[PDB]
């Protein structure tokens, strides 16, 4: 989902990828419902392309002209980060050079 609807690296890519755990900085005892990712999109992204549009997802028969409802959903959903989450469900901090 991250490699298709969010951030895509080209196959002919030169550079480094550096990630480190960041549970200290972005957890909050209550959920850190502030990060968000794109869940629904009608096609794959192109390499090094960025999409920030909301554009309610059709996914049905009714057009849903700008209004959310049945089969029409908001594509951006929030991560739930808590300090008690196990490794693999707690934040990681990524820089790509």
């Amino acid at each position, epitope marked *: *989902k991250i490699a298709d609807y969010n951030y895509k690296l080209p196959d002919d890519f030169t550079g480094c990828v550096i990630a480190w755990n960041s549970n200290n900085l972005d957890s909050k005892v209550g*959920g850190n419902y502030n990060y968000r990712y794109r*869940l629904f999109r009608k096609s794959n992204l192109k390499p090094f392309e960025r999409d920030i549009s909301t554009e309610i997802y*059709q996914a*049905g028969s009714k057009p849903c002209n700008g209004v959310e409802g049945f089969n029409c*959903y*908001f594509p951006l*959903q929030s991560y739930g980060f808590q300090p008690t989450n196990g490794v693999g469900y707690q934040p990681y901090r990524v820089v790509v050079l």
Partner: antibody
Framework: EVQLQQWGAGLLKPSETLSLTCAVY????????WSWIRQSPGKGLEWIGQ???????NYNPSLKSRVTMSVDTSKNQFSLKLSSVTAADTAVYYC????????WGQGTLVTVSS | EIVMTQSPGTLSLSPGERATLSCRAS???????LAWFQQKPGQAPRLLIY???SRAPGIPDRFSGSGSGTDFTLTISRLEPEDFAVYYC?????????FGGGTKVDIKR
């Protein structure tokens, strides 16, 4: 209204390749994702993957290494290939539209035995 | 891969009563994106509740849903003879789309 009709072999021997095909009538084929879902009495409903008309596929991480999906746009069909089949793949397979929520196929039973 | 757990699968109750089915998840569901499915034997599942509160078009108004966070429940106000089936959860606020386990409602004697 969408009508989904699916067909495929119902008996396989171990280490064979499962092939199923679903055909869509009534609505536009493009602009949607088409999904495959199995159901087994042992565990329950499980989502396998989905594909759109351009050939972009989303796969379940558990079955990412032995699932392939194809699309035939001329005659509005999409097909599933599940390789290295095993006796644990006996289930009922449905073809649905997008996440479901509106339209489902009738579902075909697949049994694997020697 | 959110693991969805559900109320014990077997529960028996007479017709014309209130039926409550509970559902929970390992992680919190974003935007309360939970759906309830009803499946009669030999047929594909059918949608009842989407968004954990709303009702699908053309659905009888004896079905209600309520919940948030990691706890949800479905309520049938009055049981009809054709209201006995298998009920399933579904979360779709996460990329790996997962269902529940299934709860079967019976007629008691």
């Amino acid at each position: 209204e969408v009508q989904l009709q699916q067909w495929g072999a119902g008996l396989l021997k171990p280490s064979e390749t499962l092939s199923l095909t679903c055909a869509v009538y009534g609505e536009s084929f493009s602009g949607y994702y088409w999904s495959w879902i199995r159901q087994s009495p042992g565990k329950g409903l499980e989502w396998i993957g989905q594909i759109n008309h351009s050939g972009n596929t989303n796969y379940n991480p558990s079955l990412k290494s032995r699932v392939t999906m194809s699309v035939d746009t001329s005659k509005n069909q999409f097909s599933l290939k599940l390789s290295s089949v095993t006796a644990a793949d006996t289930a009922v397979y449905y073809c649905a539209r997008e996440l479901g929520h509106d339209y489902w196929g009738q579902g075909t039973l697949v049994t694997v035995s020697s | 891969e959110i693991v969805m757990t559900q109320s014990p699968g077997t529960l028996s109750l007479s017709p014309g009563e209130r039926a409550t089915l509970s559902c929970r998840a390992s992680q919190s569901i974003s935007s309360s994106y939970l759906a309830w499915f009803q499946q009669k034997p030999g047929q594909a599942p059918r949608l009842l509740i989407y968004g954990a509160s709303s009702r699908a078009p053309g659905i009888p108004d004896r079905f209600s849903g309520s919940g948030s966070g990691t706890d949800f429940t479905l309520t049938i106000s009055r049981l009809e003879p054709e209201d006995f089936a298998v009920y399933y959860c579904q979360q779709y606020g996460d990329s790996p789309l997962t269902f529940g386990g299934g709860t079967k409602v019976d007629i008691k004697r």
